[PDB]
Amino acid sequence: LSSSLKTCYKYLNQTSRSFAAVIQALDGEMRNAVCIFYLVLRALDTLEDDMTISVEKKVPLLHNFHSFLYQPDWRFMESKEKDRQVLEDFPTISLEFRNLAEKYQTVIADICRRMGIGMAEFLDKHVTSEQEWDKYCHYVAGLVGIGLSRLFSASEFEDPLVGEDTERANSMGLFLQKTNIIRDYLEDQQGGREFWPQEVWSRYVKKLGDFALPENIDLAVQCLNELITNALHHIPDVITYLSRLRNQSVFNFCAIPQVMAIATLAACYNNQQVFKGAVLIRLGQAVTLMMDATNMPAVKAIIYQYMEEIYHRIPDSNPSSSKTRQIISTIRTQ
Amino acid sequence: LSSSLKTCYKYLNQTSRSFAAVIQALDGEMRNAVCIFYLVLRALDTLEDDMTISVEKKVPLLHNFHSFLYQPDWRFMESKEKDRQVLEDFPTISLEFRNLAEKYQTVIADICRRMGIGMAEFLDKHVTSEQEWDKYCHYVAGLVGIGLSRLFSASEFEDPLVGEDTERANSMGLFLQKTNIIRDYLEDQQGGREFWPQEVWSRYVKKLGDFALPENIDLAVQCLNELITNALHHIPDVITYLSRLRNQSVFNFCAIPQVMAIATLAACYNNQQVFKGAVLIRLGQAVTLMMDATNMPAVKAIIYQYMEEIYHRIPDSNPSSSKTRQIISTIRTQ
Amino acid sequence: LSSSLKTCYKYLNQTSRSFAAVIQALDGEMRNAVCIFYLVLRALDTLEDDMTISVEKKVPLLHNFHSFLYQPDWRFMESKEKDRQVLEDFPTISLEFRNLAEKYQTVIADICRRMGIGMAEFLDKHVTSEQEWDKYCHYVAGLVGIGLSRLFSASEFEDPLVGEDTERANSMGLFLQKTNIIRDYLEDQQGGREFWPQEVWSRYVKKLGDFALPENIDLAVQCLNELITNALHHIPDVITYLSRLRNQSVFNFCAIPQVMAIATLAACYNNQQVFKGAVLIRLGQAVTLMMDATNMPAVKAIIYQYMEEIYHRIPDSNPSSSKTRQIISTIRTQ
Amino acid sequence: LSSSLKTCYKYLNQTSRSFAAVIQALDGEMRNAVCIFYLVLRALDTLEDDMTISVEKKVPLLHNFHSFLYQPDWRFMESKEKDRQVLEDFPTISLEFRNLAEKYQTVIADICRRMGIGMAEFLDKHVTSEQEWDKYCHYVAGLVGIGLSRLFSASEFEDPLVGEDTERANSMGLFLQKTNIIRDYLEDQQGGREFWPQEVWSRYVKKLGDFALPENIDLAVQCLNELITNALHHIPDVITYLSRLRNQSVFNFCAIPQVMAIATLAACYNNQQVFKGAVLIRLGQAVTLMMDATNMPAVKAIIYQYMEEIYHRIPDSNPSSSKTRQIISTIRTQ
Amino acid sequence: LSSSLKTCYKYLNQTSRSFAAVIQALDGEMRNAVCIFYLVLRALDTLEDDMTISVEKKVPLLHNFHSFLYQPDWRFMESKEKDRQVLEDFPTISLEFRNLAEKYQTVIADICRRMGIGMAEFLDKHVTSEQEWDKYCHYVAGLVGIGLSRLFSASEFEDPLVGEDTERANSMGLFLQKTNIIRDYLEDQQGGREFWPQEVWSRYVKKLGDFALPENIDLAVQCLNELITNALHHIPDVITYLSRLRNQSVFNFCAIPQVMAIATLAACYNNQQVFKGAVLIRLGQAVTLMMDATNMPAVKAIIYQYMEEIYHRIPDSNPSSSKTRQIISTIRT
Amino acid sequence: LSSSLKTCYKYLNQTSRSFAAVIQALDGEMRNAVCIFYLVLRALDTLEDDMTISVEKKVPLLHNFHSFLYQPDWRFMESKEKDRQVLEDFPTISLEFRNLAEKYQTVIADICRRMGIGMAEFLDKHVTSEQEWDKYCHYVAGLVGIGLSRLFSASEFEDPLVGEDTERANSMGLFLQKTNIIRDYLEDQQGGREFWPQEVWSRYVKKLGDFALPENIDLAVQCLNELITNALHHIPDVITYLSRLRNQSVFNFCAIPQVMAIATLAACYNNQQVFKGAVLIRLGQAVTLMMDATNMPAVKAIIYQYMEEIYHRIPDSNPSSSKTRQIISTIRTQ
Numbered sequence A, B, C, D, F: 001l002s003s004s005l006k007t008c009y010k011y012l013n014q015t016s017r018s019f020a021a022v023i024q025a026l027d028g029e030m031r032n033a034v035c036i037f038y039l040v041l042r043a044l045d046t047l048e049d050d051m052t053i054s055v056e057k058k059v060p061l062l063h064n065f066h067s068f069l070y071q072p073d074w075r076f077m078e079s080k081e082k083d084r085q086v087l088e089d090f091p092t093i094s095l096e097f098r099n100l101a102e103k104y105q106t107v108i109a110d111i112c113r114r115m116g117i118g119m120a121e122f123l124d125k126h127v128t129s130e131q132e133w134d135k136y137c138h139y140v141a142g143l144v145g146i147g148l149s150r151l152f153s154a155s156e157f158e159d160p161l162v163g164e165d166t167e168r169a170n171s172m173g174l175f176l177q178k179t180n181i182i183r184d185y186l187e188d189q190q191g192g193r194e195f196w197p198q199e200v201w202s203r204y205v206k207k208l209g210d211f212a213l214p215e216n217i218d219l220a221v222q223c224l225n226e227l228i229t230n231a232l233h234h235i236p237d238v239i240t241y242l243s244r245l246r247n248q249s250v251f252n253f254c255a256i257p258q259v260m261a262i263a264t265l266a267a268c269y270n271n272q273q274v275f276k277g278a279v280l281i282r283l284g285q286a287v288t289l290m291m292d293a294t295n296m297p298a299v300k301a302i303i304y305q306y307m308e309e310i311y312h313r314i315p316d317s318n319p320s321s322s323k324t325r326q327i328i329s330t331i332r333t334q
Numbered sequence E: 001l002s003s004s005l006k007t008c009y010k011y012l013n014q015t016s017r018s019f020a021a022v023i024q025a026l027d028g029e030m031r032n033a034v035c036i037f038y039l040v041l042r043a044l045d046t047l048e049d050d051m052t053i054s055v056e057k058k059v060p061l062l063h064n065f066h067s068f069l070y071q072p073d074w075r076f077m078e079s080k081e082k083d084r085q086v087l088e089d090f091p092t093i094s095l096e097f098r099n100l101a102e103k104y105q106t107v108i109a110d111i112c113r114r115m116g117i118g119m120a121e122f123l124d125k126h127v128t129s130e131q132e133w134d135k136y137c138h139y140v141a142g143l144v145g146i147g148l149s150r151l152f153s154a155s156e157f158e159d160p161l162v163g164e165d166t167e168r169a170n171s172m173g174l175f176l177q178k179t180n181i182i183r184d185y186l187e188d189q190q191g192g193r194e195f196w197p198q199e200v201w202s203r204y205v206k207k208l209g210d211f212a213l214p215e216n217i218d219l220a221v222q223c224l225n226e227l228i229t230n231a232l233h234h235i236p237d238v239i240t241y242l243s244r245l246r247n248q249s250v251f252n253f254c255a256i257p258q259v260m261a262i263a264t265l266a267a268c269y270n271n272q273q274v275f276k277g278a279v280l281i282r283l284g285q286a287v288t289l290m291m292d293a294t295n296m297p298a299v300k301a302i303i304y305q306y307m308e309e310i311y312h313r314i315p316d317s318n319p320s321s322s323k324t325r326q327i328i329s330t331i332r333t
């Protein structure tokens, strides 16, 4: 019955309109910690997003975002973004963050800390290579996974082992990030920002904007593919991660998203539409129709069912084949 | 393999259309208890519902119902409703009732009594105040919720607290009753019955029956929204009542119906169709498209997602706009 | 890191769009055993179907199929069936059979020996009596349930009783088989195959190929319903069986296929279209809407809902009307 | 039905006084996997101590031991050790090794290859420096812990971390091996083998065999305490290792052996007996007589009890008294 | 607060020291159910025991004992056995029996019914073949296993699969009963009751009592060894039965008495004391010193450790050599 | 890691042979919170003991000990008791106290405050009534139960009820305490210390010391039994208390002592050795040989088992013969 909290949850259902629901399904003290944790990285991203802010001003701010969590009156008004309310009415968010147990604060604070540094590290440059494309996702998604993992263990609703495992807690983040990137391609383009790592989109066209050009379809799609064959390598980890979870609320919160992504990459795979406007996430076979993503055996089958939708449409003309099959063949025998 | 019991189940699937399946999938003892509990509650209901009966002859049959169960030859060939064989063949029903461990009989007992009394206490009047509305839903549904909670704690399948907290069990019942009273308005009106609370619909029109007139449809919807916003208050209880359950079997029987209800209110919210025909209740987006109501965290994600579906379709000019927002905010933060 | 085991899963998906996903979702050692069990079974079946093979040759192969399991080099190159890949590269599948623990080997080997004996036995004939239909379903489906059961128990993932009760295992087998044999009526007739128990369709028509001619659809649906009734007799066993499984992955692998079978039987029941095209498997009621088949109680509810969709469809004018209601009543009383 | 696996378990009980029981009590797969791993390691070890085998002849055997696992008929009949039956009937053991799943073979074979290389290195040499004493121990006991550890993570019975963290695994190995050496002193000396690091025992006497002489007991016990102090340093890792275990059978298999070692290091600390005959593991305090080593806390309790038994006996006049205390402290404050 | 319930537990402790503590540690309703069950069995077995009751007077008693449960005043005063307190005051026990929920009564009444018929079947004869040894061990112990299993399952504390597995449940009982019939040779001899299979001891001596004579000691141990070998075969089932359990109270209740019997056989194997007096239970070696029979892995490990003690003392000369080893070989693989 | 915290643990092991081990085994925050607690109670106790600290100086010390906790420099250098170390180095211990979460401090200080006052009240008197034996055991033992209990609940490792039900916590405390006063009759007598309630021994002899006399052994043992009987009355609470615990470290910590005390009373019951020397714990008969005190079911069993040990030895000729049976009988039927 706290004005600040209610408002916090008003921002959660506002910005993170896809997780919101499951976040509110999290058991006990995990509920707020994550809700607030989502608002702050939502706010932290808005700052990094907002392009009407100088690089030499954004950088400082980015780096200290983690310090503002203890500045009762910190705030931002000059932000001209749709999610700018989180910045404007931040004090509300910081107040509640300030009522979170110390064990949860340390983590959230610590993650904003490094996420920031990293976000700034890629504020003047582009995603160079694959090897580099992971560093970025690690900063904007990976670290989030680690943070969430540490919150679970810290809440003692999950085994201490979920926190330790970060390599996988990271893949969990990299998979989604790479997914979204690869999904809303035109959106990022029509927005003034490039994200598809170079060294790969390069070997196709000269400017990853060409892909939005009609007489490109071929090189367009093909690139998309090998970009997906890259993301699919995170499945084995995503499966291992979830296989360790022992809390139902936590399982859903982690599982659902991962499954929407696979459903996404299975729809985006070789689907030209990925450049026209938007792709609809068509579901799986007439078997995974009686299986919700709430128990591991179900999840797996659901993944496998999607891996098939892909392995099925894999064209030989594609220079990304073989590997596409080499990865899916591994997710099958694991 | 009781030729009689086999009959009882035939009747269960012959009347309790929306509960038969979950009642049958109830573990061991609750299976027969809860089944009979319905067949009798049906009887006591199919009577109040038969207008052919004179009020002089109806009132008795109600109070003296909690003791017909113990009257081997009782029946009521003098009825013209639909669920009449549950009275004309009542002995087969009463018989099986005596076959239940006295502790189960003791519950089904102290209720038919407390019900026919409250039920009788309404044969003449109509629902007036909002408060008087709960009171009615109590005698008709709230009691059922409590008696079940009694049965669940009695079988030892659930903790003793479920049947102890008569309040939560009541909300469980009221939420189901109101959602129906709301949903079945047009049908009730056409029938000749009026369950909508007078102090509410009178603030909109002269006769509760006017809402049937296509001319007053706009007012009818405003009242709908008001009543719906009322019913949304039982949710916090519902969740609480549902999270205490430990038995899968029982959980399904409880959660699904509440979920079906929540889904219903969201279907009807600000929906004129409630005054013209029948509303088709559908699921959530693609997040709740991946879950089912068999486990609490998932149930919560569904409940939370139906709320947002309501919160978005709220008109600013609607009389209850902020009342609705207030409780939906209470639900997402609590 | 074995190309032979990888290849197997490739074949597992190339030929089982119906199970590959729930098979690869199985826990620990059951995964490979069931995958390979499925492959040799599939390979055995391709032999028993390959029409371009003289009975004066096909028999011994069916009789000695079990033995080709211990022969590194055995393989069949002269096949023209769809899934002939498994026969041509059998040394790859057999190699992996020999890599499984010895207890799964003796199980798969025993079923492969018994199934071949039965298969060869029905090459030179059709299903006469209704007790031969059983015997035949036993050899192609029933033994598969026993085998699978024997393995589940052998792995200790499931109780030892699951394997011991071959009677209940058999039902599981017969129920899935009969269903397919009923749904696939048109597909079988348009292919020189007689699977319906002729001791039945002979009391409705002269030739089994007459149910095709529209002038006899009334006698057809009439025969259709008699069989669907016969098969419904297995459901109790199906329930007894699924109620024993304690491992989730295994539960999914068993319950899903079963629920699908019923959904089909409930769509094909009294449906004329059976003799014109394929039947479209609708949805799980409006109650079974929020519940999937991953837990026994739910699977119970789901099953009963379908038992109703058929009960509220039995034409009093159908000669099977009594049996049908009889059993549906038995099923729900238990 | 396998008589060779029965033979294997007979050898497990003839060769492993200490582990047969906890091994046989291992869950499912880990059972045979550990049994056979223990048996090939036994054969490798027996080939190593066999002193009637010249050194030039023995290297090729130790180097190729891992490869003979895959030579069905390989056997060694020229050994004169006592457990030489495992080598004379090695074909039976390797048979069942080849019957294990490939994922275990890869682990067991790899640990065999590296353990051979290592055993070979120390043939022509003696253990000198503590860092060398550690090296030898890694080659004979460390790698075993790593082996078992990778076997547990492969069976999915334990977390993926158990296997990945090789240092903790090696700690478990070293701790047990160091203990025997420290205890089997006399028995070794009366054999012709020296395992006590030289840089240590040397600074006490001229010949290791001198500690045997009754006129050195003072230097005997003093050295004994230095080495034990060296050993105690592994306990922090031992405790960390065991606390990540989640499977009871495996926990039993890991803890029991360790509590045994620690009980031994305790009964040996500052005990002239080590140089005259065997020391008797006299159980600890009264508090432990009601405790068993099957749960983590009790094991924490047991270890801490043994630490005190050692701490209360640390004589000031000991060259390492300030070392022994400083480490037990670190154990107590961890 | 019940005086008659209070009384029942007093009886439980007087007549069954080997189980009283684990029975009282049982969860919820299982506690009262298993207590009463033990008491009526205690009586039924006391009637069978009393050798001062004629066979023609005894047959009716065993046959109708189960109905006596429902005869409030029924009691028996002509018993001369020392456990007859429950017989003389059976109305207190029966009163608490009619107090137990029905689902429990139905199980306890059924076992008493079946055990009646069986105990009566053997008043006339002696156990001859090993096969008959099982039928007999079935009536006095196996049914107690089946009854127990069904009680656990009915209580909901244990899985439905437990009370459904009558084959393994039966084994749990045969095992315990054989270990005792074996261990209590010299005791059964001075009482005039013979429980060792005749088709077995007859291959060694003229009268089973001859094993009591010091110059047959060698033949005695050889017989003792054959029988123990026979009892060992139930261990696999026992391990399967125990593995299934999930409730701690129910586990400790089933495990401990089995481990105890295992310990007993280990101590009696190729041991002469059996024929001269009493054999005291040795305990765990090096591994067992940190393990207790309260978790399955630990249970198994102890049992393996025991199987080994026997295996190590198996003389190659004993006519049961290959069997004794063969069975231990199945138990450890 | 902190040097002071290590020092604390050194003291814990030197001043606690009965809890040092089990305490260090405790999880998370409870570890330290309980260590400090024992240390400060240990000191306060050493003050009370020390017979060279005049009443004039001792009273103020006791009453104000709890305040000495928040005073950085407070120390006591005139103790002559062996454990004096914790007093001379009190600032080190008080430093750590001040580092415990504020909530743990509230408990430790309150127990110290209450304990001091009460210890001071018994300085110039002995225990007369049994009613007074209770109030004493409370001030020195019971309050420790309340402390520990209040602490487990604060840490949230146990449910709040554990801390609330102070009566059951007091009992756990008095039982251990009373038992000790028994066992140590002679050791205390040779200390001019009298703890055996005067209103009880007064009725057998003339002076509490007359029991050391060989001719009074008869009356000696009779009194013994009465007290032992008195002690048995706490067992019901003990069982209740222990059955409420959810954490294994906390269960061990609490169970071991209780079981140890019950064994001590069984050994002492009617044993003339109480007045001639020391009585050691007889070995858990037969049924209790294979049981540790790590799970409730086993603890009850061990307890019920020791009850019979007593019950068997009760002679009709004991004045308290009847009360001893009575209480035990109550313990049996609960």
Ligand SMILES: CC(C)=CCC/C(C)=C/CC/C(C)=C/CSP(=O)(O)OP(=O)(O)O
Pocket: C015, C016, C017, C018, C019, C140, C141, C142, C144, C145, C146, C148, C149, C169, C172, C173, C176, C177, C180, C253, C254, C257
């Ligand atoms: C687990 C258990 C105890 C019993 C189940 C027993 C089973 C699986 C029996 C075989 C049943 C059939 C005929 C399955 C579909 S054939 P298909 O795979 O060729 O059909 P498709 O076209 O792929 O869907």
